[PDB]
Design a protein around this ligand. Structure first.
Ligand code: PM1
Length: 266
């Protein structure tokens, strides 16, 4: 709309950085029943959720608060030394608060990934944007569950947690079956013992190869036992045994959480 001045295209809808030719405000402008669905999102305000400032419907643009960097760019920029654990823990804690908030309002993100988590110079991290990467997709979605729950967001976050720690994607699948098999090779092929009802899932196949589960100590070293304990609960196969965001916030891992400030090059 004529109320903004596209400053730069910051990412392919397409996201532009823009200045409100009126309020001088700089914002992120995203060019995209869905109406009222998005208006409700405009009421979902939390410090760890990128603020949806306005919805301009004209012949659909979403006006968001502008943050200078996403986690993917930050992880890439910290690949040599990695993100300090104190900061990893602070980010995980804040994202869990954001999810606890979203989930309490029966709202799911459904597609969390490093590129959708934005950070600022003060140490805050926020959930944004509530081929397409499958690396963070929960197994129940991959198995064709049509009515998945808030637990799909915990799975995705557990994945990002593992990636921040190891500096390598946990399950970099490049197809739906490769994604599923990478999860199986690491966490063990699921069965009725660990996931009641799993064999009845739409895309479950008795012909799936049976891989043995690997120890977490080999998956996210050098994360401490509290960290591995939390991650394990965030990656349970059964969406119902998977830890909720609220309970996760009470895990011993966060007993000594702080809010460090990252060093960013804007
Ligand atoms: N500086 C920024 N401020 C914001 C504010 C909101 C969204 C936002 O809501 C959002 C979106 F609209 C689409 C995809 C991912 C998102 F996080 C993205 N950004 C950015 C980005 O730099 C960026 C990061 C990744 C992809 C594209 C732009």
């Amino acid at each position: 709309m004529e109320n903004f001045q596209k400053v730069e295209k910051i990412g392919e809808g397409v996201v532009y950085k823009a200045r409100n030719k009126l309020t001088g405000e700089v914002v992120a402008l995203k060019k995209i029943t869905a109406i009222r669905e998005i208006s409700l999102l405009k009421e979902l305000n939390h410090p760890n959720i990128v603020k949806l400032l306005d919805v301009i419907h004209t012949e659909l643009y979403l006006v968001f608060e502008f943050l200078h960097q996403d986690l993917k760019k930050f992880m890439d920029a910290s690949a040599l030394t990695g993100i300090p654990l104190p900061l990893i823990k602070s980010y995980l804690f804040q994202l869990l608060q954001g999810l606890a908030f979203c989930h309490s309002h029966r709202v799911l993100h459904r597609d969390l990934k490093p590129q959708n988590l934005l950070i600022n110079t003060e140490g805050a991290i926020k959930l944004a944007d509530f081929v397409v990467t499958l690396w963070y997709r929960a197994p129940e979605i991959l198995l064709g569950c049509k009515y998945y729950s808030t637990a799909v967001d915990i799975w995705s976050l557990g994945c990002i947690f593992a990636e921040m720690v190891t500096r390598r994607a946990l399950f970099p699948g490049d197809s739906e079956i490769d994604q599923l098999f990478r999860i199986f090779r690491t966490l063990g092929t699921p069965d009725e013992v660990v996931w009641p009802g799993v064999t009845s899932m739409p895309d479950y196949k008795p012909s799936f190869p049976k891989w043995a589960r690997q120890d977490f100590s080999k998956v996210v070293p050098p994360l401490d036992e509290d960290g591995r304990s939390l991650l394990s609960q965030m990656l349970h196969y059964d969406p119902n045994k998977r830890i909720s965001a609220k309970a996760a916030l009470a895990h011993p891992f966060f007993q000594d959480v702080t809010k460090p400030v990252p060093h960013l090059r804007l």
